[PDB]
Design an enzyme around this catalytic site. Sequence first.
Site, PDB file in Angstrom:
ATOM      1  CG  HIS A 123      -1.789   0.925   1.214  1.00 29.06           C
ATOM      2  ND1 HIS A 123      -1.532   2.114   1.760  1.00 29.06           N
ATOM      3  CD2 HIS A 123      -3.363   0.997   1.530  1.00 29.06           C
ATOM      4  CE1 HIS A 123      -2.838   3.021   1.894  1.00 29.06           C
ATOM      5  NE2 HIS A 123      -3.884   2.071   1.699  1.00 29.06           N
ATOM      6  CG  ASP A 200       0.680  -1.898   6.102  1.00 31.12           C
ATOM      7  OD1 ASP A 200      -0.335  -1.826   6.977  1.00 31.12           O
ATOM      8  OD2 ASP A 200       0.428  -1.279   5.054  1.00 31.12           O
ATOM      9  CD  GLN A 203      -7.549  -5.091   4.932  1.00 30.87           C
ATOM     10  OE1 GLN A 203      -8.639  -5.702   4.878  1.00 30.87           O
ATOM     11  NE2 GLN A 203      -7.384  -3.857   4.386  1.00 30.87           N
ATOM     12  CE  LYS A 226      -7.888   0.078   5.878  1.00 34.89           C
ATOM     13  NZ  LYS A 226      -6.700  -0.150   5.054  1.00 34.89           N
ATOM     14  CB  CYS A 363      -3.796   3.044  -1.571  1.00 32.63           C
ATOM     15  SG  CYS A 363      -4.959   4.156  -1.231  1.00 32.63           S
TER      16      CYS A 363
END
Lengths: 408, 408
Positions: A123, A200, A203, A226, A363
């Site tokens: 991303h 990261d 998600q 999220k 993104c």
Amino acid sequence: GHMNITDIREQFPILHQQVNGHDLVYLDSAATSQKPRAVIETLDKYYNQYNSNVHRGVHTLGTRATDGYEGAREKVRKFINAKSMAEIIFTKGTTTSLNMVALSYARANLKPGDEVVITYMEHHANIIPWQQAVKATGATLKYIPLQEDGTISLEDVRETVTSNTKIVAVSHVSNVLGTVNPIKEMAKIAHDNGAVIVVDGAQSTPHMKIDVQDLDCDFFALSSHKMCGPTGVGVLYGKKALLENMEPAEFGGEMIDFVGLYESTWKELPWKFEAGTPIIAGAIGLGAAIDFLEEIGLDEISRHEHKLAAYALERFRQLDGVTVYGPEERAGLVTFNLDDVHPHDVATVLDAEGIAVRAGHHCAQPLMKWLDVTATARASFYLYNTEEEIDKLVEALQKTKEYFTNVF
Amino acid sequence: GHMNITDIREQFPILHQQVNGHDLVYLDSAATSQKPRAVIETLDKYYNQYNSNVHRGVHTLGTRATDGYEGAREKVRKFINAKSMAEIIFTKGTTTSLNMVALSYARANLKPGDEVVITYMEHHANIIPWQQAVKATGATLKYIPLQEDGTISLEDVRETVTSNTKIVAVSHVSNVLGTVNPIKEMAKIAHDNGAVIVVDGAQSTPHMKIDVQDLDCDFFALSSHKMCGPTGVGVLYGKKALLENMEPAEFGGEMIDFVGLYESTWKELPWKFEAGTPIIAGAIGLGAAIDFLEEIGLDEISRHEHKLAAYALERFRQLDGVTVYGPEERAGLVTFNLDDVHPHDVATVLDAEGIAVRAGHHCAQPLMKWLDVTATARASFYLYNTEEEIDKLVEALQKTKEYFTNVF
């Protein structure tokens, strides 16, 4: 123990409405998730009953707000299995967390000849801060290549990471491909070469248990919005020894100890990194989102998403002229294109049937270029979605394909 | 037109409760303000009905959330009389706004021999970012002195600002002294010397009309939580021509146009400066706080606070052994000490009577040193406070003075 999807959906007021005359079918949780009443009513109770500034502790509501805010820090610590609240920093979201590592760690520790290693599926949040950090230091940015199914092989990691690599930054879960990356084995490779690993996890955190001691990641970033939590709030986890040696990324009240005219000293961790009045309500609401998910069980939520993902892949394979990107083993999302139909038009037609999906580059422009497409459509699933909703999606895709073939 | 304080207080659920058996008397709005139902129910409606990510516009709830978020940007523009939404940047709060100016403007525009000029009354948010910016550039930090009553004379400004000054940064209203500084005349002095002026308006915006075209400030920073709005959200206003030439302070999704492997281009203003998923609910709630204050009338709110301030100063002067800091003309707050009693003990005793005040340095250590005290107590007023509440405060101060004289 087993999750009842009717009882779960009952808790999300926003699911119970129509769009364009059709029941809402919300398949965009990878862009942002919906909230249960337990979270919304946590914000209400905060603002109705005990809002006040925090870390004074001189009057009763201020003590309550402080206990709520720091209590939520501890909820986050337990939730990702960090050793210490000193390691849990509240930020505005994953993007700011990653920028804090790039400003306070990367730009302080990169020299010409050093390497930052990322991957083609990242991303933008996990790409641009490193582009800027290497430009500012004269270091070099490198990309781990991807296999044909959009996964990462550990031999490609070993080939890309070298004795000059100082940082490997990689997503736990891709918001486009659904790939779960081998973070734990990548951290061992990074450390074997003298690097830190920055994960990261925007998600992965909503959808699967995180244990940063087992992952052995050096930094881990996540976003509340999220994972059923309020907007505007995130976390940066970092190993205490690294955070201790990093300077703040922001300066102001609350993160100082002593302020002279020209020089100041900083608080201990975590508050060293929390300048100004903090995101009080949002952090407390993120703690409530954690209590909510933990009561359902992240492993239950993962199993439910694995079921929906396998069902969606099967039913997508029943459609002619539809291309799905990424591997068979995956998180709860499907990114795809219809032959002959721009994904923006797919999304538009689907919204006229009440179905919310995303169309665009998600993104991840370098990933679209790797996929040799300009844009894709994406349906994403969470703990309130059902197989019936996936049926509605694949039926609407079939009728979209028929509609556009006949207009032609 | 005239404000009814009973009808205003009715809208703030949190005021209607007891602490330690006494009706709550909340006199800490300078630390953070309480929220009316119109704001809390704005957040509720967002999360119950139209949460979705913004700036896609491909499905119905996403369009609604986008219209709500950008609609709030326009509400802020009108509220401070900015020329353009390009000039209105949503941030995490005043502190982050000021840090963005220090990172993206100061550190790009300061050389050895340049000066940043601040004042001894600044909050730490408007001190530490400049200490760090001058250290990073080798520039010089300077302080405008204060008059004996804690105001700033324009001749001292003229003496401190020189042809080498590039930045003057100053509070609109002091959170300690209550001083309203002569921002408009200071901006003319700054521009006459070749400097920009950065205005910390965290304490003026809740309480008085802001017109940035009349002030002619180059940058203006404010926080939602002090002005009946949600926590975790603020604004940076900057003149469009300055913002156009500044690089982003944060990098990621949403603030890019094109992303290559090594180089990226940025969005137009304001989104250039808004990296990652934005503070969607909090910004919409800040727009509702603006609608709420505008319906009452900022001039009405200022007149009410002037009345409470003049009443409080008079009644404080009726107490023996109590010292008030700052000028007679002031915003709605009184910072003080009792002879012989540490302000932390004052605040503790007052909370046992239900009264919430703040004790400490109020994030202004250089000002405490200028005042020759280690700490002070502070009572602060907003649109829901009354003269009866000030009576309760001064009566509790008298009984505090009697209590501590007799324990001795």
